[PDB]
Motif scaffolding. Sequence first.
Motif, PDB file in Angstrom:
ATOM      1  N   UNK E  15       0.821  -1.212   0.000  1.00 30.90           N
ATOM      2  CA  UNK E  15       0.000   0.000   0.000  1.00 30.90           C
ATOM      3  C   UNK E  15       0.860   1.269   0.000  1.00 30.90           C
ATOM      4  N   UNK E  16       0.281   2.386  -0.431  1.00 33.03           N
ATOM      5  CA  UNK E  16       0.989   3.666  -0.417  1.00 33.03           C
ATOM      6  C   UNK E  16       0.132   4.814   0.120  1.00 33.03           C
ATOM      7  N   UNK E  17      -1.064   4.490   0.600  1.00 32.57           N
ATOM      8  CA  UNK E  17      -1.967   5.504   1.128  1.00 32.57           C
ATOM      9  C   UNK E  17      -1.401   6.167   2.382  1.00 32.57           C
ATOM     10  N   UNK E  18      -1.610   7.475   2.507  1.00 28.58           N
ATOM     11  CA  UNK E  18      -1.040   8.227   3.619  1.00 28.58           C
ATOM     12  C   UNK E  18      -2.098   8.995   4.409  1.00 28.58           C
ATOM     13  N   UNK E 311      -9.642  20.111   1.835  1.00 28.79           N
ATOM     14  CA  UNK E 311      -9.210  19.587   0.543  1.00 28.79           C
ATOM     15  C   UNK E 311      -9.115  18.067   0.587  1.00 28.79           C
ATOM     16  N   UNK E 312      -8.822  17.535   1.773  1.00 30.97           N
ATOM     17  CA  UNK E 312      -8.662  16.098   1.977  1.00 30.97           C
ATOM     18  C   UNK E 312      -9.076  15.687   3.385  1.00 30.97           C
ATOM     19  N   UNK E 313      -9.745  14.543   3.492  1.00 30.07           N
ATOM     20  CA  UNK E 313     -10.127  14.009   4.797  1.00 30.07           C
ATOM     21  C   UNK E 313     -10.078  12.497   4.810  1.00 30.07           C
ATOM     22  N   UNK E 314      -8.964  11.941   5.295  1.00 29.53           N
ATOM     23  CA  UNK E 314      -8.791  10.483   5.329  1.00 29.53           C
ATOM     24  C   UNK E 314      -8.405   9.955   6.722  1.00 29.53           C
ATOM     25  N   UNK E 315      -9.078   8.875   7.120  1.00 31.99           N
ATOM     26  CA  UNK E 315      -8.944   8.271   8.445  1.00 31.99           C
ATOM     27  C   UNK E 315      -8.025   7.053   8.432  1.00 31.99           C
ATOM     28  N   UNK E 316      -7.091   6.987   9.378  1.00 31.37           N
ATOM     29  CA  UNK E 316      -6.263   5.798   9.511  1.00 31.37           C
ATOM     30  C   UNK E 316      -7.099   4.681  10.124  1.00 31.37           C
ATOM     31  N   UNK E 317      -7.161   3.538   9.433  1.00 34.35           N
ATOM     32  CA  UNK E 317      -7.863   2.340   9.916  1.00 34.35           C
ATOM     33  C   UNK E 317      -6.889   1.189  10.196  1.00 34.35           C
ATOM     34  N   UNK E 318      -5.847   1.080   9.376  1.00 35.25           N
ATOM     35  CA  UNK E 318      -4.860   0.035   9.564  1.00 35.25           C
ATOM     36  C   UNK E 318      -3.694   0.546  10.382  1.00 35.25           C
ATOM     37  N   UNK E 319      -2.532  -0.072  10.206  1.00 33.93           N
ATOM     38  CA  UNK E 319      -1.355   0.318  10.967  1.00 33.93           C
ATOM     39  C   UNK E 319      -0.242   0.817  10.058  1.00 33.93           C
ATOM     40  N   UNK E 320       0.836   1.281  10.678  1.00 36.44           N
ATOM     41  CA  UNK E 320       1.942   1.903   9.965  1.00 36.44           C
ATOM     42  C   UNK E 320       2.638   0.904   9.042  1.00 36.44           C
ATOM     43  N   UNK E 321       2.916   1.335   7.814  1.00 34.89           N
ATOM     44  CA  UNK E 321       3.460   0.437   6.800  1.00 34.89           C
ATOM     45  C   UNK E 321       4.979   0.552   6.692  1.00 34.89           C
TER      46      UNK E 321
END
Lengths: 175, 175, 175, 323, 323, 323
Positions: E15-18, E311-321
């Motif tokens: 994954x590469x999502x931040x 401009x952006x709103x994203x929630x962390x659900x998993x853990x650090x990659x």
Amino acid sequence: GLFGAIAGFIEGGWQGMVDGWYGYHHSNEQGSGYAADKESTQKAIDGVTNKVNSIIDKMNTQFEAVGREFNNLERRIENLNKKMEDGFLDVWTYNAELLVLMENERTLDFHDSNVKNLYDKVRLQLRDNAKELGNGCFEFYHRCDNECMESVRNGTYDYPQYSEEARLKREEISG
Amino acid sequence: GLFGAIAGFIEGGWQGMVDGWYGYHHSNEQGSGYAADKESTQKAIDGVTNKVNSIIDKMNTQFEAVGREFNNLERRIENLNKKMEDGFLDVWTYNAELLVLMENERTLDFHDSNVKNLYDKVRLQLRDNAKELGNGCFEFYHRCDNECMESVRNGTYDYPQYSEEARLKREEISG
Amino acid sequence: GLFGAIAGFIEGGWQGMVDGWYGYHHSNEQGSGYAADKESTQKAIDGVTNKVNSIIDKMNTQFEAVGREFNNLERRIENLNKKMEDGFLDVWTYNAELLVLMENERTLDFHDSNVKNLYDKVRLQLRDNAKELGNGCFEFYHRCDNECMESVRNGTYDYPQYSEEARLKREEISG
Amino acid sequence: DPGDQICIGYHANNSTEQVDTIMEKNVTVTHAQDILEKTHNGKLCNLDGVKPLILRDCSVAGWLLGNPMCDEFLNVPEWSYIVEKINPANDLCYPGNFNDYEELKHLLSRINHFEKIQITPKNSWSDHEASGVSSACPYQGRSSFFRNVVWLTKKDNAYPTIKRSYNNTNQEDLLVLWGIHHPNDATEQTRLYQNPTTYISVGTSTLNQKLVPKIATRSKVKGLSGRMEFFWTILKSNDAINFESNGNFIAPENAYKIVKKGDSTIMKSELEYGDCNTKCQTPIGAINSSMPFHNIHPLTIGECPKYVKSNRLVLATGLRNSP
Amino acid sequence: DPGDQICIGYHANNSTEQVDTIMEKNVTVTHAQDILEKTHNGKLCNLDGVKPLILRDCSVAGWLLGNPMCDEFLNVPEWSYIVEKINPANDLCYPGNFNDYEELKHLLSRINHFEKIQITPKNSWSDHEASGVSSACPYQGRSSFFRNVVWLTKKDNAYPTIKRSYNNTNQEDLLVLWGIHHPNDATEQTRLYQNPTTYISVGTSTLNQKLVPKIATRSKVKGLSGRMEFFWTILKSNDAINFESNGNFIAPENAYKIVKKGDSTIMKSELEYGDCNTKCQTPIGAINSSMPFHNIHPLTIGECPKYVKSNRLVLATGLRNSP
Amino acid sequence: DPGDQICIGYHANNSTEQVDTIMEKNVTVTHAQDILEKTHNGKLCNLDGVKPLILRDCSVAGWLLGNPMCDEFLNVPEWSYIVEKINPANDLCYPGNFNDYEELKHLLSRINHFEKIQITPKNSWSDHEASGVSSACPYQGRSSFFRNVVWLTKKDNAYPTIKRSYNNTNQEDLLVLWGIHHPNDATEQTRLYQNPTTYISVGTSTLNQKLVPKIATRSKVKGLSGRMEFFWTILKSNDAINFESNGNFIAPENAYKIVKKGDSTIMKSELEYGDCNTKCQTPIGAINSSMPFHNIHPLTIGECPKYVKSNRLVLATGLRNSP
Ligand SMILES: *[C@@H]1O[C@H](CO[C@@H]2O[C@@H](C)[C@@H](O)[C@@H](O)[C@@H]2O)[C@@H](O[C@@H]2O[C@H](CO)[C@@H](O)[C@H](O)[C@H]2NC(C)=O)[C@H](O[C@H]2O[C@@H](C)[C@@H](O)[C@@H](O)[C@@H]2O)[C@H]1NC(C)=O
Ligand SMILES: CC(=O)N[C@@H]1[C@@H](O[C@@H]2O[C@H](CO)[C@H](O)[C@H](O[C@]3(C(=O)O)C[C@H](O)[C@@H](NC(C)=O)[C@H]([C@H](O)[C@H](O)CO)O3)[C@H]2O)[C@H](O)[C@@H](CO)O[C@H]1O
Ligand SMILES: *[C@@H]1O[C@H](CO)[C@@H](O[C@@H]2O[C@H](CO)[C@@H](O)[C@H](O)[C@H]2NC(C)=O)[C@H](O[C@H]2O[C@@H](C)[C@@H](O)[C@@H](O)[C@@H]2O)[C@H]1NC(C)=O
Ligand SMILES: *[C@@H]1O[C@H](CO)[C@@H](O[C@@H]2O[C@H](CO)[C@@H](O)[C@H](O)[C@H]2NC(C)=O)[C@H](O[C@H]2O[C@@H](C)[C@@H](O)[C@@H](O)[C@@H]2O)[C@H]1NC(C)=O
Ligand SMILES: *[C@@H]1O[C@H](CO)[C@@H](O)[C@H](O)[C@H]1NC(C)=O
Ligand SMILES: *[C@@H]1O[C@H](CO)[C@@H](O)[C@H](O)[C@H]1NC(C)=O
Ligand SMILES: *[C@@H]1O[C@H](CO)[C@@H](O)[C@H](O)[C@H]1NC(C)=O
């Protein structure tokens, strides 16, 4: 507190260590001395400074009041205007005070998390080549010059390379 | 991390680990392998899923703007209407960004805490029937088939039943 | 919890202990019994009492609605007034509900941290003069009267005073 | 025997600074950062390079109409913001009222620069007396009147009907002002304007106004039982304004060209100019700070910190300090 | 030899999502969830089954009074919301003003359907001329007038006094509109209505009104110097309205029964119909999303996400990659 | 054998209290604290020591003008708040309207006590009939009128011009009320007031008012189509009010001295007195509580909890409870 380290199994700090936030005090034949773990201090000085800038930038867009005037038979909307402006100043005052209280609580527990992790960092490195005194100090089972102490601080300490002199010494106590 | 497990004393995650969030890399006579701890992962998916549901419905009652018009000698109340509506939008935009900023950080530390508690879950069970290598791995002082491994993962590992073989093996090393 | 003590490696609470929140159960020749650590429960009551007062004092300045009347051709500002007041009531309802959820979660993890820190307080004093059973219990390598138990509860336990009697006992086991 | 040792620990110093948290108050820390500006210089300054318009004891009404005691502001340069006292002394010198005053004030706080011009010269009134004056409007110990409008009265024993018009051939918009006089009784009415039943009409592309005097007896204000009532409009470029009257007409002499619009405000303050310069101004003093918050006053202008009602806001940056 | 092992670890991916946090930015993570809608379809749609009323180059005033260039809206079906341009071309064709316009537009947002009815037939005026027309109001190349009100003038050389009445015997309420004409000079007043001194009285159980023309000199707008001023009231079920006038009266011909009430709004936009359908509409495009937030526009209607300025709103659900 | 032990553990009980968290709901706990008051007593009480002014079926206008059916309230004592019904029965008995009523009602929420005085004796009208009366305003089986204002009509066959003045020599400020009558036709206008064309002038240091009757055709309300329109002003201490009129004048008889100002409100409620006492009152019942929050009503007066729209608010004090 949430942590057990600061004001915990380690009581009090070292006024004599003035190079960082976290580090080492060693006491062998080549006298005494202090040493600051820069890496853990660097992540800590960078970590906290990220925090203070983010909180400042979240507040740049915040309510600003402007004066408006009303005549003597506009009492109702004058009262509307006053209550609305007072309302927002209370909302944003609550938002700033409560935010400083919350992040103060995390900042102190954050340094504390870094102290325990560094302690656990070396306790995992030395293992049975030393004794845990239980107050932040480790008295190991062999001799260390001024290049051995260095090997633990840069995390290269080869465990079996000192296991033998140690193995001898703990048997000597077991005598 | 705030716990020392992720990117800490255990380094990196396992690309070969694809059945859960937390688990084991096992290596005995019956080859190598990966395995997920099911029980703790359910409490973990339930935890994040409750969080996001709590986060959404807490915002369902929020300010809605309405268009209102004013003529040329109503500039004062036109301006009042604009500051009030802009005012509520900055408040709820702030509320939404800060809550996501805060709960992200806690979500990452929730995973870190869950790994460390899992590590301590097997370490408190084994004791001196194994050695801490210092990277999250436990090397037994005996041999463990694929029915011993299971007893630790469901937390039933009978300690005294294997204590002697380990004690013997460890004295052989201590000679 | 985030710490693993309450409902973790320590399972269940003691209904028979009715003098505090955290404490000790001793089991020697002078029977059994329960005993509360006064020191840690008091600092725990002081922390929570401060919190609950802080939550009340943070809400003392909050929006208050006042009734206003408008005639049949003031509909636009009647609608403005209603939405502004309803708007503040939605904001302060969110602030109070969310603060309670957040501080509930931390209050529960505060007790969890406090049980484990008390446990490590004792684990650090005894070390190899006792064994970790893995359920919150310490089995000594020597004898503890009702004044030895006391030396551990107030943290005065003299280690070398039992180092010898103990060391012999584990050799009988490790032989 | 004692062998070699190594220990882990943290920094301590002689700090005495305190921070608060929700579970515990007044915690001493090694390093802290205050984030609240609590001081101002107690002065009124320039905003960037630009000087404010500081009225003294003059009100907005006094200035624009030209109360004779307000001659300092007959031609002001570009300003950055405006300062006015709570209860200015030099307001409407002749008693009466200013129609839609609060809306004119709001308009004024969107403007940075006027340029005054003469639209109808005082020497163009050839069938009326254009030298009306009152003791309620003194200048140098003697009776005067507003400088931007003219009090017309009967000449010989007649008040011919006035028909006058003005076309805004300027590129910018014009602020135009005028008034109507309400006498005390029928006798005073005929002495001033000759005709007993009068009116004022004013027309524009959007304005359609008709005024009639109210003749009656009222309480004395500064010795007068008469009243003056004033009006204003914005005359757009290339439009024309039309006046017609057979009495009680207070006519235009000067008007204002709107040269520049921008962010401005009208401040309520008792202070005066301080010969200084700043980027943040409040009614009780200016701010030169880098703090993210301030707590001096909620009504500010310029590039400022954010306002809160807190007495203290200090952030923990270091760690807990050993006693 | 090495004995047996067991190791502790966590999930990792490609994954590469931040996501962001307060202590560290752009942290790449294994699992994340977006909650902010950032796309719209850019058109105007039906709301549920119901098509909106899209005036084109018409305003609400143009529509309701019956501007000759708005005959498209003479009888409109039930609507869900109303769409209007910023500066419509077909407004008040005869220059003047519409009284309490903004309050009437506000009333309009609780209404979904009008049903037009006749109050006074055009051929019922047997002592007045009912055919007034103007070049400021063209139809197909010729001079015309508003369709829902009538311009009455003198017949022969008289304007007898008008007394007209109506009782609302319907169950629903009535929106009634009427007006007055302001001439430029006395000659025109006599040319149109014969009587020099005129009035309009309007009475209801709650309304008690009296209008008098304002005759004066004004700028030319679209070649004209005359003005028309329009008025309105809601007549309650079972109440009666009474009109009386001896000149300058622009009488009601048609009025509106408010037959369907509900939720609506008036949107300002330049777009045209899009033959699409939605349950959430904004002035610049429609929304088909399931996100709990959106950031398109603050003014929506229907069942919508909540608006935010992010401009952006994203929630962390998993853990650090792992890097 | 098992040797000596020592174990660490925590408290448990038989509690059933539940708390909520952001990650988890209904968590059973050993100790919890309720902070939301959810109960009221359903009565209208005194506020501290002070009894409220409870109008019954009278409205504020009825009380202040002195509707003959509100004679209970001719002289009320100091009050703590005011209770008025939603749709009071005894209001304006003669049909009409009350000018700037909602601004007056707002003024009243800063007042705790009035003292009524007579300013014009009924036997002071020596050239007019001061005994006007109507069947819409009954008293004790006979026709009557408002007690605080007086209906003057022609005497013999005349109505001379009235010029009357009053100086407020009281220390306190005065609420002064007056009215004007709008007849139905010119004939009725002549039988009551004789003169066909009338006016009313009212002047103060700040007020300059002129009223003219509107004679016209209206619906019948309570059998009448005539109308009365009322006005008010606050006369400062040591100022004077001047009346001039030649008809349609409803003159002052009694006025109100503002004796005490303070915190007050006007509550809408159908309830009646309950002979109880409280420190926190809402329109539907009083509150005796120690909780920091409540959810009974947003409109309160006195020393109250903070209002929220929540059903439950419980704080975790203890720890999680073992089954
Ligand atoms: C508006 O019209 C209504 C109903 O129609 C009328 O009723 C007939 C008696 C006759 O007058 C017809 O020519 C009308 O079209 C009328 O209401 C009626 O009034 C009459 C006379 O009192 C009574 O039958 C009754 O009061 C009422 N009838 C019904 C079936 O409702 C209105 O006048 C009256 O309305 C009632 C509600 C009362 O308030 C009464 O005082 C009032 O005059 C009429 N509107 C007005 C303003 O007159
Ligand atoms: C003020 C003046 O001198 N105007 C001159 C022009 O006269 C007016 O010009 C306009 C624009 O060209 C119109 O034709 C006017 O005529 C009408 C109109 O509105 O079109 C004709 C209508 O039939 C008439 N309606 C009624 C019911 O009487 C209408 C009304 O009388 C007025 O609007 C009432 O206010 O006027 C016309 O009057 C002149 O045509 C032009 C060129 O010669 O020069 C202008 O200076
Ligand atoms: C104000 O005076 C100006 C200057 O003469 C007028 O504008 C000019 O008028 C001439 C004469 O017909 C004509 O060429 C143009 O209308 C215009 N010329 C230039 C170069 O600007 C103006 O009169 C006219 O202005 C136009 C826009 C319109 O209102 C027209 O109906 C009007 O007569 C004068 N303004 C008024 C309101 O009279
Ligand atoms: C209302 O009556 C009072 C009582 O006499 C007036 O006050 C007095 O007025 C006389 C007349 O010149 C004078 O002695 C004082 O002005 C004052 N004296 C006392 C003892 O009060 C009052 O008129 C006067 O009020 C003062 C404040 C001032 O404005 C003066 O110009 C005015 O004539 C009467 N009110 C009005 C509006 O006339
Ligand atoms: C915190 O310290 C300040 C410093 O003077 C003191 O005034 C205040 O009373 C203290 N607060 C408490 C709760 O002790
Ligand atoms: C974070 O990542 C985005 C997208 O890759 C990038 O545009 C941005 O510049 C990064 N942050 C900073 C501070 O540069
Ligand atoms: C939590 O427990 C209460 C107590 O009965 C119950 O009413 C409620 O429904 C429970 N929560 C949910 C989400 O159902």
